[PDB]
Amino acid sequence: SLTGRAFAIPLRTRFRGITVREGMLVRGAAGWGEFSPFAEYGPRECARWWAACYEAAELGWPAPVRDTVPVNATVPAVGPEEAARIVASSGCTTAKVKVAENDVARVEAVRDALGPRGRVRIDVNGAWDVDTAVRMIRLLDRFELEYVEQPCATVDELAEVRRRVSVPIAARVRDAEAADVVVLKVQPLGGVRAALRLAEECGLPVVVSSAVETSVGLAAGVALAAALPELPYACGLATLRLLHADVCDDPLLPVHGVLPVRRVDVSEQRLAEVEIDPAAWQARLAAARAAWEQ
């Protein structure tokens, strides 16, 4: 519709299992919001994704305490040579390296491209069992890891891994001694305000990451990072680079390792090029909204 449009954008390579980013853009009084939960999430889970979209489109975000936010490079599971080029071209001194999608060689290459002063984090997306996580982290440890994100699927597993490794683990989680850092993603958490509340309640240092959104969704991620007390860790919001296209003429692409805190303007021409019939997505959005309001 005029105010609710669906998109389908191919990524440049498979990342966390996906190769095509789909979702809806909704226009409200405050601007545009993005509702892009991955296919597997049911209405009860999607309810929070919609809440984030609604906040962005109709409510606005809490005022920022900083005008720019530091970002890290997101390196997908590509060859070590390509990984280095991505890092060298990122303009960022922190890089997240995807593993468990040549994993060791990729991390080595990234550390080499960044030099001794760079920061290297690992993205496992909960693919390892406890024992595999311990042996892989040990192998990757010689590259000096800032932290390893979600090595295992559950809290009990994260807790056991944490007892046996000497690198911080990113995921109450603190009460279970399952994490050193908590990763915040605006959409699944229900918006900037909801994410800010969790940041306080979790009682642990936090880092902001994205759900590989278009610039509309990333703008909300930047608003969250811009409203947090502090950012000891670079934010994983430089993911627009993983997509072949965006829905804005002035995309949220990092320069000098940072992103500006600003709203984005959806471009008719850009959106139309990646637009799809919204019927199915509108039905899905309706179910999520129903779950949220109830």
Please report the DSSP string for 157-222 in residue order: HHHHHHHH-SS-EE--TTTTT--SBEEE-HHHHTSHHHHHHHHHHT-S-EEEB--S--HHHHHHHH
Give the CA count within 13 Å in the CB-facing half-sphere of 146: 22
Whether 98 is a known active-site residue: answer yes
Is 132 annotated in a binding site? The answer is: no
Is 216 annotated in a binding site? The answer is: no
Enter the tokens of residue 126: 């909960």
Which domains are seen in the chain, by residue range? 1-59+268-294 (3.30.390.10), 60-267 (3.20.20.120)
Contact, 209 vs 233, CB < 8 A?
no
Contact, 187 vs 49, CB < 8 A?
yes
- Residue of 48, 121, 185, 270 marked active site: 185
Enter the tokens of residue 229: 């007390």
Is 96 annotated in a binding site? The answer is: yes
Distance CA 282, CA 220 (A): 21
Q: Of the candidates 218, 291, 286, which has an alpha carbon nearest to the alpha carbon of residue 252?
A: 218
Enter the tokens of residue 89: 């071209």
To the nearest 10°, the Cα dihedral for 15, 21, 23, 29? 90
Q: What is the DSSP string of 244-268?
A: S--SBSS----BTTEEE-----B-H
Is 125 annotated in a binding site? The answer is: yes
Is 185 annotated in a binding site? The answer is: yes
Experimental method: X-ray
Distance CA 86, CA 75 (A): 7
Task: Strand 145-149: give its sheet, edge to edge.
Answer: 73-75, 94-98, 119-123, 145-149, 169-170
Contact, 65 vs 226, CB < 8 A?
yes
Q: What is the dihedral sign for C-alpha 222, 22, 246, 13?
A: positive
Q: What is the resolution of this structure in A?
A: 1.6
Contact, 26 vs 50, CB < 8 A?
no
Where the chain is discontinuous (C–N > 2.5 Å), the residues before each break are 101, 171
Enter the tokens of residue 279: 């019927």
Enter the tokens of residue 140: 């990757």
- Residue of 5, 98, 121, 284 marked active site: 98
